[PDB]
Write an enzyme that holds these catalytic residues in place. Structure first.
Site, PDB file in Angstrom:
ATOM      1  N   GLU A   4      24.302  37.127  79.486  1.00  0.00           N
ATOM      2  CA  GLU A   4      24.708  37.991  78.391  1.00  0.00           C
ATOM      3  C   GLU A   4      25.373  39.261  78.890  1.00  0.00           C
ATOM      4  OE1 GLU A   4      22.819  41.045  78.780  1.00  0.00           O
ATOM      5  OE2 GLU A   4      22.329  39.615  80.406  1.00  0.00           O
ATOM      6  N   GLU A  28      24.111  39.309  82.934  1.00  0.00           N
ATOM      7  CA  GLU A  28      25.361  38.529  82.965  1.00  0.00           C
ATOM      8  C   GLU A  28      25.166  37.092  83.398  1.00  0.00           C
ATOM      9  OE1 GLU A  28      28.165  40.154  85.750  1.00  0.00           O
ATOM     10  OE2 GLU A  28      27.959  42.214  84.881  1.00  0.00           O
TER      11      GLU A  28
HETATM   12  O1  NIO Z   1      16.863  41.342  83.480  1.00  0.00           O
HETATM   13  C1  NIO Z   1      18.052  41.482  83.055  1.00  0.00           C
HETATM   14  O2  NIO Z   1      18.822  40.476  82.932  1.00  0.00           O
HETATM   15  C2  NIO Z   1      18.542  42.873  82.692  1.00  0.00           C
HETATM   16  C3  NIO Z   1      17.636  43.979  82.847  1.00  0.00           C
HETATM   17  C4  NIO Z   1      18.191  45.217  82.482  1.00  0.00           C
HETATM   18  C5  NIO Z   1      19.468  45.465  82.025  1.00  0.00           C
HETATM   19  N1  NIO Z   1      20.252  44.312  81.899  1.00  0.00           N
HETATM   20  C6  NIO Z   1      19.840  43.048  82.216  1.00  0.00           C
END
Ligand code: NIO
Ligand code: NIO
Lengths: 346, 346
Positions: free
Chosen positions: A171, A314
């Site tokens: 994501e 991602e």
């Molecule tokens: O664990 C993840 O994928 C994550 C954690 C913090 C911020 N963005 C993604």
């Protein structure tokens, strides 16, 4: 959709027994390769795999979307980063891109609700320009959630038709660790303080506000923990919905899906809630540095293979674990046999 | 040898500061890639690497040898398996072979003391036909230990001359988890019961005898924990010595070495005891299922990346971690930069 859920195949116990036996005969002390053995057997039970641990083409599906809750001051990244990064995904300069290339996987960027103009090169499945602010109401309508699930589900199974055997989910959405935490709290029955993390470098001070926002989201929407679609639509987001959809799609297709980090765990809880039959197709990748990771994993009953203190998202952790999956296959197919070397172990 | 130890280079703090800065500028929230970042910086400090995280050719060195302690009934594998498996190493059918091929690494099989006729295709550095039975005396002479260290050390650094930038260490020797446990006990000050494991499927009953054997080895030889060479020669083995030698060689050459499992941890304790300068060149791979692993790792102050419940040996865990090392390099060289996308984070 009820159909779809209906048709998720059970794992092939017969292929699994055959795999186990084959593995036991390999050139090593029995069970000495531990989790690599268990993985191989798990893969063998997956119907889309043709009764053996195999890996053909690989794909990482990245679901991008914006969240109204960003307005609550729960994230330090500018909102526009979602759109910028989605574009970067098209140029191969992002973390998941670099890691996927190393794994020989292809990245599919999917726009499920970015709050910006459409980005050329990105798969368009946009629901809206960002979801509703969960602090004061629901993220979207049940209809909207169900439709997206359906649509992503199909897109996913369709890739199978083209040679993909292994999926990875990811994501991209500024502020998405907030809805992720709310879902985790709801499904787990954990208090918000226990599952709310710093996300993308949220300053320690600002935490309290994040916890309050989560609590509000829950009090206000009253999502039903027994209804995963209910939860997703109320306190989730488009990106989270799309991730659950990939999981539902792979399962229906009888193929394995590699989870990523915290956001992915939240989507996995929902998918499992919606359809328990999904569980056997999921494969953990790494152990996210997000505070609520341990709790989420415990509820999924999963122990990740990699401890990298990662927290980028991602689908970067998923890509990083792909070689592990291929290793279990190589082990299975390429190792010699005890019998052939005349080795007999008690 | 004193020379060799003398000439181990310190890490390049300057290259490291440059790496850190570069990493911080990448397209992601700072420190979001966690351990992958730390690894990259660690590599950048390695002089043989040319001031940047890079990986050229890869090699797994497997040290094979027999142990007199096998006679104490501490292992269920027939003694001949050492010789059989060493031969198999030449045909590419073993676990390490399959995993190394997947990683694009080459396997070097080295005979440092197999109790059998020489095996064609295997590098010959044989000290003797198996080492002495540590239960009633020393494994070998100090001279013998020192000579082997020297010889393997050189062989190792020589590979560097031919393009190898990343080493992996492994072993093969029936009953070797016994001397491994003795060393661990000695260096760690832990009681034998705490560090003695089941090795290659030793039955639970037989454990007690294994613990007694370890204790005896120690009482009888009185190895000095402050002298790593003393310990290796008394309660170690040729295979263990050869592994320490690879570590000393890579360090002198200013190159990184990937550890494997339990046997490798024991060799690492000795190497660090012999030369602390060695430490910065070591990289953990996985978390061995052997009982005494946690203790050994704690003393090395290392946290492995992979949790696979593996316990095969041969350098299989090292091979499996190689892609991780390459990932840190890919991240470092191929990711885009924040500035270029006009992304500003507080
Ligand atoms: O664990 C993840 O994928 C994550 C954690 C913090 C911020 N963005 C993604
Ligand atoms: O950890 C290892 O490498 C190991 C453990 C048991 C038996 N052989 C190897």
């Amino acid at each position: 959709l009820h159909a779809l859920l209906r048709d998720i195949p059970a794992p092939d116990a017969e292929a699994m027994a055959r795999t186990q036996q084959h593995i036991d005969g390999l050139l090593k002390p029995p069970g000495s390769l531990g989790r690599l053995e268990t993985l191989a057997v798990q893969l063998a039970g997956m119907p889309g795999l043709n009764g053996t641990p195999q890996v053909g083409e690989k794909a990482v599906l990245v679901m991008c979307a914006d969240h109204g809750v960003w307005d609550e001051g729960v994230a330090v990244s500018p909102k526009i980063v979602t759109a910028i990064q989605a574009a970067n995904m098209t140029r191969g300069t992002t973390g998941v891109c670099v890691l996927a290339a190393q794994a020989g996987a292809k990245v599919h960027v999917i726009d499920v609700g970015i709050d910006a103009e459409p980005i050329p090169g990105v798969v368009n499945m946009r629901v809206a320009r960002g979801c509703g602010n969960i602090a004061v109401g629901p993220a979207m309508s049940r209809l909207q959630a169900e439709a997206l699930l359906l649509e992503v589900s199909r897109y996913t199974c369709d890739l199978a038709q083209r040679g993909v055997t292994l999926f990875g989910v990811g994501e991209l959405g500024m502020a998405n660790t907030t809805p992720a935490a709310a879902m985790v709290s709801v499904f787990t029955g954990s208090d918000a303080k226990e599952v709310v993390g710093i996300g993308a470098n949220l300053p320690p001070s600002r935490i309290d506000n994040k916890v309050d926002v989560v609590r509000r989201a829950i009090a206000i929407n009253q999502p039903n923990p027994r209804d995963g679609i209910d939860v997703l639509s109320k306190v989730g987001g488009f990106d989270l919905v799309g991730m659950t959809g990939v999981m539902l799609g792979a399962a229906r297709c009888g193929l394995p899906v590699l989870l990523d980090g915290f956001l992915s765990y939240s989507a996995a809880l929902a998918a499992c809630q919606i359809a328990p039959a999904v569980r056997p197709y999921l494969i953990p990748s790494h152990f996210s540095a997000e505070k609520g990771a341990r709790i989420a994993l415990a509820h999924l009953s999963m122990e990740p293979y990699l401890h990298m203190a990662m927290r980028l998202g991602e689908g970067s952790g998923a890509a990083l674990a792909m070689p592990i999956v291929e290793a279990a296959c190589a082990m299975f197919h390429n190792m010699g046999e005890l019998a052939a070397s005349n080795i007999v172990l008690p």
